[PDB]
Every structure is written in structure tokens, then in C-alpha cells.
Amino acid sequence: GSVTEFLKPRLVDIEQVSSTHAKVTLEPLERGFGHTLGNALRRILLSSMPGCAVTEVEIDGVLHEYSTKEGVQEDILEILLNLKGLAVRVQGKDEVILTLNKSGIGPVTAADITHDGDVEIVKPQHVICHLTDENASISMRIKVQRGRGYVPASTRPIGRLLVDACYSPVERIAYNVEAARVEQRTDLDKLVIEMETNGTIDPEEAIRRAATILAEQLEAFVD
Amino acid sequence: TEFLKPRLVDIEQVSSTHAKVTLEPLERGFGHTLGNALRRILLSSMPGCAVTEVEIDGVLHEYSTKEGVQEDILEILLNLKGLAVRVQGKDEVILTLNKSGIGPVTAADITHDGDVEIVKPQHVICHLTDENASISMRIKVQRGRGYVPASTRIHSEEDERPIGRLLVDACYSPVERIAYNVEAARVEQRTDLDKLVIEMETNGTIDPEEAIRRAATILAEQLEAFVDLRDV
Amino acid sequence: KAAKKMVEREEAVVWDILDEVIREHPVLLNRAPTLHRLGIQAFEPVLIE
Amino acid sequence: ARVTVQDAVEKIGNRFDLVLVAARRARQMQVGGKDPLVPEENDKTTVIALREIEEGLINNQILDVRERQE
Amino acid sequence: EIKELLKLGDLPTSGQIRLYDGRTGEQFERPVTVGYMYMLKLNHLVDDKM
Amino acid sequence: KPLVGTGMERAVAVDSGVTAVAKRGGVVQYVDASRIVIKVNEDEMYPGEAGIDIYNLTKYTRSNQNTCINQMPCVSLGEPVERGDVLADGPSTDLGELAL
Amino acid sequence: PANGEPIIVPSQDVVLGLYYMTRDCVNAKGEGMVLTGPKEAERLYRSGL
């Protein structure tokens, strides 16, 4: 055969575990190309994928990072931690400030956030902090911004406290290159991508976005 | 919300076989992504044109010698295995090397052909050491990919009836070593953009621009599968 | 005899048959000094070039 | 596809009545007289028989009962 | 003297350079030894045995 | 080559029969992968005969362990050679140095 | 069969990998932050942050 045609994945089968997981296996791929594709896609997903997340917060009664809130048994670090795991999506609006004025007994669920049209919470039942059967109240303002990757607080008055924003929708990428077989050839590699997301976008759509990004990057060179 | 697209900026050629590109406007990190992907593609898949077959006038196999040459036929085949040539209009061609007289038999002495071009004519194939001695061999070059060993090429025998035909191990891979570097490009109105610098050492057959274009094309085309997974 | 000749020439169809047979058919690996009973263990083969 | 037989030995004790019962069941399944119970999913008669034993639809008692019925 | 001969070129004196993983593309931590070792090929070939 | 030898590799090659060695110094007159012709220096030659030394090399003959012993020339045409110097590198030798 | 200890002990290279990977450096990159679980830890590690 000519030197232009290469083996392409003729069998690909995505298996999603019922909420947000996905085992994507695409085999057969030519020898040593599974590692290339897995590395490129994993690095794109883990480093550069547009998204939105909570960046910083401002609490009316709390000003110092290490502080105790009267009524919430969970510590401020725990509140920022739960807020870090919150999964949100935003429309064309780039920045939005939400508020969580709540008072009662039960847990301070994410569903108690003030409703908006441009903001959608994929996990309204998410827990932010617990509350006691007291007049104690929780009032805070969270800032949601649109970014590209991961930026801890160390990278970057009020005073307000910072949060390590995680804009990337993906949460775990670990590809595996398993030996495959086609006719007498058996050195062919088979790609087994494994992905989890925060729920904003299904893993297959995440892979599609990653491929679109990479291909758009490889546009001028291709002929 | 979107990344800048990289475009080649220079083809700086320190030597004929040594080249440096500069995919440049690279955005965040991709530098390493594109560098590693391109290095792996270039080292794996590139169209080479290394010698495949040799037919010497009076040699019955590749373990005897020929009177008048100070190298065994095995050493001659080893030397030819590294011959660097470029073919344009055909995927397989036959050359004709004839020489008579003491001295080295360089690849320059190969019969000239319109489409074929020997990249480094100095390349030494054998050495005649007798005035009344000569060598007359037919070289069969063909364009392939990767590295196909001689034993596995002969599977159906492709009607290899003649016994004077010697098969050398094909080495279709013009690139010898590829290394990429990432450095902060100094654009004015942007915090920090990466610039990729791919330094490659070919054997002279493939121009750097063509090689990088080929690698980018293969990576983009093969990635089309992921662009639409489409369930099963 | 035809089957023997086909296997001897190593036709391309035999590979699918072999991969069908190997699927669930343990083979006993065994080292030379089998001092104790853990020197003979049965694995499931995986065809390798 | 199967890995271990721990559930099998849990169901049938002695890890030796297991081998014999599975052998007899696989023998009936293999020679073209009988048919399987658990849905075959590309496995072989041995692993299918072990699947039947593990899931709990066959043992020595049930095997002898089905035999004496015939 | 090995250090002197290493430094006569430009290779690091300690004798360990930093290797980049071939597949991942990201650096290996803890720089690693590399050097030109002389290796034989013992005649216990596999196709004589298998 | 041994890139890190022990300085005691020339003796192993020369003293064992395989490496071959010029019996008498002189200038090479004809080098071919099968044979070598050495024109002995006039001072090293006996008065009677007009001696020229012909070394017939061995080309791909089986050794007792089925490995292939092969002697190739390591001296170009018209190059001087002295007494007891390596001419035809044997199997697993390089310019007279053992290369295993 | 001789003693009630396992015979599948990770032996000589897997063990070095785990030992190097389950350790602490008094001051390495990104010491002292808070993570939302093992997934966040792996994601941080791969990116090199």
C-alpha cells in the first residue's frame, strides 16, 4: 500500500457509568499512536478547557481566613472546600455574583443559591455547609468567572478570601494503551480513555471539544 | 475564550540535514503538547526512500566476497542500507551503479536519473583495489514507511525466483532525531505566550516544511475520530 | 490432511480459530526446580508475537 | 470471561465436588445432547458451567435430580 | 579523574543528566544516570530454546 | 569497540590466532577482502628468495559453536605495515582490539 | 501452603515506586493547600502545579 493511508479506529465503544463517567475505547490505532492521542487529549482536557467556577467569596461575619462561624459546625476551610466542588455553568455572561442568604436548621444546600437565568447549577442538592436549630444565619457572596484551566490561590482589601478555581470541567483523565490485534499484525495499540466530569458536559462532548481545540490548533500546518 | 493558532515563522537551516522550525504563536502549555505529539509522529511515521534490493553481477548470496573489492558483499549491503536518496515521480525505481578502476565507489558514481537525486554524493559504498576490476550492480529503491525487516517482507515470496537478488533491511524514516524547546515569546499585548522550536536532524531527503506539514496533517486527520465519537 | 496442510502453510483464517480456542483454556506454567506446589500455576494464555 | 471461583467454593463446599459437578455439567453441555441454562456470552462450556454453579442454579443434588427425571 | 574527563567536554560532572520521558513528554524528576556501557550478546538465543 | 577497556585487549586479539598478523614488515601491494599481499622490505628479505607474503583470509566458515568466524582486511592499499602488526581483523575484533 | 502469609508481595520495583510516591518532602511545590478529594490531587499532580 501507499505511504499515505494509516490505520484508523474502526471500532469505538463508549460506556458511561450512569451519571458522568465514561470509558471510551477506540481501537485499532497504528503502533505508538495511542500514546500520542492520549497524551494530547489528556493534556488539553486537564490544562486548557473553557469553563466556569467559583473564584472568591465574601462572608459578612467572617473576614479572617481561619475563623469560626457561630452556628455552622463546619469550619471556613470546609465551606470553601465545598464551594470548590460546586459545579456551575454560565451562559454568554462571563462574570456573575451569587448570594446565599439562608437561615434555618437543615443543611445549606446549593439549591438555596439565589436563582438566575444565566447561571445553572448541575448539582442543586450539593452541600455547602450544615446548620443548627438556631437563629444563626449564613450570608455570603460568591464570585463565578469564566476561565480556561486551573489556578490555585497562591498564584494570585475588603478583606475577601480566595478560592482555588477549577474551571476545567474534567476531573480525572487516565488513558491506557492496551495491545490490540488486526490480522497477522498484533503490535497495534488500542486506546482506553477514562473520564469523569463535574456534570456540566457529558464526557463524549468533552472529548469532542478537546478534539476540536486540538484540530483548530493544527490548522495552518495541515495542507 | 479561544486560543491563537500557531503558524510557521522560520525554516532556519543550519545545515542541509539539520533544520529548526518555530511553530510560534503557541498559547498556554500546548507548547509541550504539540511538541511531544509532533516529535512522536515525526519519529514514527514519515515517507522514507531507503534502498530495498540489490542485484550484483557475479554474487550468488550476501555471505561471499567479490574479487577486486576490499569489502564483503555483506558490508556493501550494510553501506547501501544507509544510502540517502530522494525520488519524486515514482514510489519505486531502479538505479545502476557501474565502476571500473582503483578507488572508492561513491554514491555519486550511481547512474544519473532525471527524477532521482543522491543527497550526499560523497557517501562511500565500497572500494575497488585492482586496476583490472569492476563492480556493476543494480540498486532497487522504493518509498515506504517505518521500518520493515527483510525477513518479514518475504512472506509470499513475491516471485523472488532469481538467486542473485539480495534484500537489505528497509529503513524508511528520514528523521534521525527530533527535539523541541519551549520559550516565552515576546509579543506586545499579551502576558506570556509560548513559542515552540523543533530542531530536527534528517538524512537530507525531506525538506523540514514538508515534514512538519505531513506530521500536522496526520495528527489532525487521525484526530477526526474523536471529533465525533458517536456512541459505539 | 487438508487441515494439516492449511495449518502448516499458516493460513490467515487459522488465527481466528486459535483466538477462539485460547479464550478459556488455561495452560500450566512450570519452572524447572518446582520445589513446592506453587511452582506449577495455571494462567490463561494471551497470544503474543 | 471469569477470574476466580471463590463464590463457587462458597456455594459448593470442598472445592472438589465443585470440580466434579462442573465437569459433569460441562460434559452434558458439550456433547450435542443438552443445552445451557445461563445465557452464553461467548464463554466456553467449562466457564459456563462454573457460572451456573456460582449463580446457584445447579449443584450435585440438582444435577442428580435432573438426571433421574430423565 | 573521571570528573575531570567529563568536564573536559561539557557533560555534567556528577554524571547524571535529566531525561525526558518518551511517551508522556514531561520531565523525569531526580536526574538520571546515562552513559555508554559495553554490552555483549550471549549466545543463549531465544529461538534456540523455544 | 570497547569504549571503556582495560588496556589489556590488544594482547588477547593478537596472541590468539584469529586476528592474524604480518609476519614481516613491508608495504601493502594488493588488498582484497579474500587475500592480502605484502611486499617485504628489502632489509627483512633473505638473499635467495624474492619474498612476498600472501595472507589468505577466511570468509564465513562455521566455528565449533556455529558462530561465523570471518576475517576482513584492516589495511588499505599501499599502506606501510611493520613486524607483528594487525592486518586482517578477525571475528569480534576492531583494528586489533578485542570487541566482544 | 507453608505459612499464612501472602505470596503476592510486591517485590522490588513496584515497592520502590510506591515508597517514592507515598512520601513527604518538608517543602515541595504547592504545600499546604486543601483539595476536594483524590481526583483533585491527581489532577493537580498531572498538570505539575
mmCIF file of C-alpha atoms in Angstrom, chain F residues 33-70:
data_model
loop_
_atom_site.group_PDB
_atom_site.id
_atom_site.type_symbol
_atom_site.label_atom_id
_atom_site.label_comp_id
_atom_site.label_asym_id
_atom_site.label_seq_id
_atom_site.Cartn_x
_atom_site.Cartn_y
_atom_site.Cartn_z
ATOM 1 C CA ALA F 33 38.509 -8.984 1.005
ATOM 2 C CA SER F 34 39.758 -12.559 0.401
ATOM 3 C CA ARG F 35 43.548 -12.107 0.404
ATOM 4 C CA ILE F 36 46.317 -9.636 1.221
ATOM 5 C CA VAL F 37 49.716 -9.299 -0.477
ATOM 6 C CA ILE F 38 52.621 -7.736 1.436
ATOM 7 C CA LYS F 39 55.883 -6.741 -0.258
ATOM 8 C CA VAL F 40 58.539 -7.403 2.376
ATOM 9 C CA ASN F 41 61.131 -4.684 2.895
ATOM 10 C CA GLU F 42 64.479 -5.317 1.225
ATOM 11 C CA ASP F 43 66.192 -5.376 4.630
ATOM 12 C CA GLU F 44 63.797 -8.018 6.010
ATOM 13 C CA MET F 45 64.187 -10.305 2.965
ATOM 14 C CA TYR F 46 66.617 -13.205 2.647
ATOM 15 C CA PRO F 47 69.229 -13.014 -0.145
ATOM 16 C CA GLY F 48 67.980 -16.084 -2.016
ATOM 17 C CA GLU F 49 64.238 -15.687 -2.473
ATOM 18 C CA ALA F 50 62.392 -12.555 -3.595
ATOM 19 C CA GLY F 51 59.717 -12.988 -0.961
ATOM 20 C CA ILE F 52 56.219 -11.527 -0.985
ATOM 21 C CA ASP F 53 53.871 -12.701 1.760
ATOM 22 C CA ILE F 54 50.373 -13.792 0.724
ATOM 23 C CA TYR F 55 47.838 -13.998 3.559
ATOM 24 C CA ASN F 56 44.728 -15.961 2.570
ATOM 25 C CA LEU F 57 41.886 -14.872 4.836
ATOM 26 C CA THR F 58 38.926 -16.967 5.984
ATOM 27 C CA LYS F 59 35.480 -15.897 4.756
ATOM 28 C CA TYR F 60 32.414 -17.107 6.659
ATOM 29 C CA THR F 61 33.376 -20.587 7.836
ATOM 30 C CA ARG F 62 31.480 -22.238 10.670
ATOM 31 C CA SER F 63 33.047 -22.309 14.116
ATOM 32 C CA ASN F 64 32.528 -25.131 16.591
ATOM 33 C CA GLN F 65 29.716 -23.192 18.321
ATOM 34 C CA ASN F 66 28.011 -22.404 14.961
ATOM 35 C CA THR F 67 29.041 -18.744 15.146
ATOM 36 C CA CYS F 68 30.616 -17.344 11.997
ATOM 37 C CA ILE F 69 34.334 -16.517 12.078
ATOM 38 C CA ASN F 70 35.215 -14.010 9.354
#
